[PDB]
Amino acid sequence: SGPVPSRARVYTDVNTHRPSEYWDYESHVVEWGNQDDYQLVRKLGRGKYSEVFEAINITNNEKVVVKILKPVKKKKIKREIKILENLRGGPNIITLADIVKDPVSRTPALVFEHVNNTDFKQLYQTLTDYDIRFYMYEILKALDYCHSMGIMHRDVKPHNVMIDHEHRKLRLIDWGLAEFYHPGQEYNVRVASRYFKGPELLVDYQMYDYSLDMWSLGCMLASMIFRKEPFFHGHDNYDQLVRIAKVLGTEDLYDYIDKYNIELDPRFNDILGRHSRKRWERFVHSENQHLVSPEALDFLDKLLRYDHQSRLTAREAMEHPYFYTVV
Template sequence: MTAQEHLPVRPKVNMHALAQFPPSYAFHDTLPCVYGRQDDYEIGRKLGYGKYSDVFEGYCPETDSSVVIKILKPVRKKKICREIKILSNLIGGPNCINLLDVVPVHGSDYPALIMEHGGLSLAHSLPQLDSQSIRIIIFQTLRALDWLHIHGIIHRDTKPGNITYDLTTHKLHLLDYGLAEFYSYGTTLHHRVASRHFKSPELLVGYQLYDYSLDIWSLGAMAAGMIFRRNPFFRGTNNVNQLDKIVEILGSAKLFDLLDKYGIKLPQARAAELRGYDGMSFDVFLNNDNQHLVCEQALDFLKKVLVYDPEERLTVREAIAHPYFDPIREQMADLAIKDIKASKKLRDSLMSAQGKDLPPHIEGIIGLHPSSLPTWKVADPDKQDFPIPISPSEMTNNPQKYDEFTEEWNEYWVTLQRNILKAGMATYGEQIDE
């Protein structure tokens, strides 16, 4: 059976999120881009590498600030355009890393992305996490995914290595949008995405009509690893063995329900290998090293996100509402308000910004060189609707405490997005003919 004959996953929310924007919002076949200057940045030590890029620490003397320099490897130009487009469309979002500049690389046909420096990778902090930090990390990652999903974007590579987290300030950033993709219901998407240990079951059986719930599975696998101090939680040695490890823990029955529901066919021999597993209780992973991190609410949360059927997984906002996060709700709501108040200067300065002469504090957040972002004819920002991220009152079990801030919250996000669009930083309008 071909991908076109499969039944597509039907999202519970944000099915037509892209419809709130002009068609050009998701267009990335080509992307005119006026580069910034490579000489504006000093390259430092190597932070990491991957299939599609090498990542270095960097420094910008102009702003006396640390940056991250992501040097792209040879790949389809459309993929590069997609990453730049998605990053520019998500600018300023909660817990999302910001694109600062795009610069040419001497001797290469491929550019480098200059990114905000988010701090240390979460992967380095995993052994030090207590139960409060784990809740905060999962909650803030959900806030980042909420911003993506309401903008019609799937991250497709959520994992500790793509998150930075400060143990003292609790500041978190979701990184690396190289595999992120615009979502349109019923559209065939590539199944060779996500890192092996965080791949969802539907990816591992070659299914291509998935939706945002892919990110929920990846987050659930990450959460299980932190809660049980078993990283990674599903320990496959390759993509075939990865599904074996999932089935050993979650059992066979629901996997075959998934295959039947969405019309997915496996080779007979492979199907036989996956049958007969009863699964196991999460309790078997409880030990002296992790028992202080495990509670009934944590186990229930994992059971509701690590679900075979994408349509039965919690959505981002359902996950945020789960009782597992009750101990940190007001802390997270207060932190969200604090971030907004700290960003007031950004919003207020953008009120009069028209894509040039941006003040220094905006240059460090939105873009060192606004002209380096794609050049587009701007749609009428005053007639554009904008999505609103989950509010402090929606984060808590005591919404009355934060209700008076809701109007200010909504106004902030609408005004920020509208004036970023006016300033030429986002790319919702029509492409200028070259």
């Protein structure tokens, strides 16, 4: 009779009870300001979807970030703007300061608050056990908030988490793949970045929810406490599920598929194999043992579960004993 339906265990009907103005991004009217107020300083990054620059707001001599958007569907631009406007001011959510267009190019550009980020490839190696607990709690404040606002980020990964370590400031950025949650909606599974994709996306289970972000957060946590980046290192989307099954095992994978009556794609036939569940303690080594604890492993175990419904919600995660030592 097809795959079994599913819905979020929390904030299930938040968009249903809100007027269409909130979630109907296609009908949202965007007012594009003049980019002449911003002087570009340097390239900060690029991305599948944009060229980002450090800039000065010439009216107040303040550093900002200008994200000049690459040629994609105008529907996607409107979605990112609406979500950023909806979440603006939320805890650890990047602040959209302005929406502008350069007068001659007319290229859509988003203006954000500047975060003096240290690339994760240089920063994660220097973090202490306390710092990992602290920054994970900061991401959880952002996720509990955006999930309460009926929004799934769908691209949680180190490159999308800006950290000003000197000021202990964290911002969740890149809301370009984010979507409104509507119970029963079948979403595109071609979201998130390979290493952080939840098993729901990999087995083409479309009725997913906020819990996808919790799998991605678990992938980040595992890479930080075990110093293994990325933790699940797939070479393609099918191999990504095989990397997961080499850790969580194939028995619990088949239980997940059966609970939701999912049909595994034939491409999995020759590559999945049979794998026993590996204990989390097997990833502890001399280089990472100072970041691992029974609380850390228990918390990781409750995030990295095939069954999206069994995973901790962001609010449940915030109540975990792993966070007792944080503010």
